[PDB]
RNA sequence: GAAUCUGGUCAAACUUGGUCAUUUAGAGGAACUAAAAGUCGUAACAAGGUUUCCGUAGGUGAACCUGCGGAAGGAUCAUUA
């Protein structure tokens, strides 16, 4: 019950994808994605993987930055958000 | 014929405003250049993998994309009768 986990999916070379799993569905997700895009400039998209819920995918190694953003805006704790690293 | 004195006249200056010029602190904001082992793509150069440009309008994360009209600086100097 509500534990946000951010992970890298390793792609070709140094280019990667960052998946945000278990996002709270309180604020508008598309809007959030747009904001993220505006911020650090990474091509964001929303994926619904076999009812895990709503997964935000971003380009590169936006993990720490994402966490910071969450802290600033919607995320309250630092604790229920875990950042993996693969 | 001195002080003094009535009007002028030239007129420095002074009080409060306004104005033009040049400076000058300047919370913040938006730039461009330089250095070009950061990040996201790959827009352009080959038909650059949707031919490029241009005017213009809209849209976007970012190169940009998409209308409408145009230009080869195009990948065509080419289909008689
Ligand atoms: Mg290209
Ligand atoms: Mg092209
Ligand atoms: Mg020229």
- Secondary-structure-based class equals alpha+beta
DSSP summary, beta strand count:
5
Radius of gyration equals: 12 Å
The hetero molecules present are: magnesium ion
- Largest sheet: number of strands, sense, barrel closure: 5 strands, mixed
Beta-strand proportion: 25-35%
Short description:
It is classed as translation. This protein has 86 residues and is α+β, with helices and mostly antiparallel strands.
Give an overview in words.
- The protein is of the alpha+beta class and 86 residues long.
- The protein has helices at residues 29-40, 64-72, and strands at residues 4-10, 16-21, 45-47, 55-59, 81-83.
- The chain has a 5-stranded mixed sheet, covered by helices on one side.
- It has a single domain, classed as Translation Initiation Factor Eif1 (2-Layer Sandwich), CATH 3.30.780.
- It is globular.
- It binds one RNA strand of 81 nucleotides through residues 15, 34, 36-44, 58-62.
């Amino acid at each position: 019950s509500n534990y946000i986990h951010i992970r890298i999916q390793q792609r070709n070379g140094r280019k990667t994808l960052t998946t945000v799993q278990g996002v709270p569905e309180e604020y508008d997700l598309k809007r959030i994605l747009k904001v993220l895009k505006k911020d650090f400039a990474c091509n964001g998209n929303i994926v619904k993987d076999p009812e895990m819920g709503e997964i935000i995918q971003l380009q590169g190694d936006q993990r720490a930055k994402v966490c910071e953003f969450m802290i600033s805006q919607l995320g309250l704790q630092k604790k229920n958000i875990k950042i993996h690293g693969f």
